[PDB]
Amino acid sequence: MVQVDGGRFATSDLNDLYRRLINRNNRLKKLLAQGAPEIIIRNEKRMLQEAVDALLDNGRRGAPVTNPGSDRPLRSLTDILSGKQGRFRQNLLGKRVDYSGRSVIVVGPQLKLHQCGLPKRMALELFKPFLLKKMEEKGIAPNVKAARRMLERQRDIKDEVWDALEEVIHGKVVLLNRAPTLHRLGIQAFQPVLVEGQSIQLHPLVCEAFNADFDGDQMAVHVPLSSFAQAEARIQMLSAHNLLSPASGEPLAKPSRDIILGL
């Protein structure tokens, strides 16, 4: 039960399913002490059951309970746990993540197979913690907390900042992902080449595995943090290290379109 921007309150549904039960339980404790007739107590015990069952699995038996003036069934405990929107599938088998961004992809014919074009604007936010430590170690700012103040207004950012980012990203890879990820080559590692502009630059040879064209496709960037994550990305997930399909064994990175046309 939290106060939103507007000062208004937003409350989970479980509270109204609990209040429902606590009212019916308390009224039953009072009806018992006052020796009410059988027809009354049994009606209360039925409603107490029906309240327990709206709380554990609302809708399973009988009519789903609903907040007045809206036909939305309240979100019971079962509903929270299950389904595509449930807890397992939506929060345990797949989460949202930090150090990640997306943008529109654009062809980069001049890229080596292991490379991609990464907007310097994205690279700043994605590697922000690394950039702070490097700024303190060079001298572009005196303490890490002042450096973060510098990057907060787009005007305060200076030139030597972008040279610090280049020192930072050296040798390290970023993961590129296009949806849907139908097989493991929907995520491939790349050495990021910093570029001006907004778009991500993709290598033409990896467009088939991703099934990416340039009719507006976008791709997600992910920054492997640990040395272990960096090592897994550079050895096992590098585009240049995954040339043959894992399903057929045939080449996947291979000439197509203009490349074939020219040859």
Binding site: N43, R46, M47, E50, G62
Partner: peptide, 8 residues
């Protein structure tokens, strides 16, 4: 199967 109709 309907609590109102049962009590009625």
């Amino acid at each position: 199967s309907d609590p109102v109709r049962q009590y009625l």
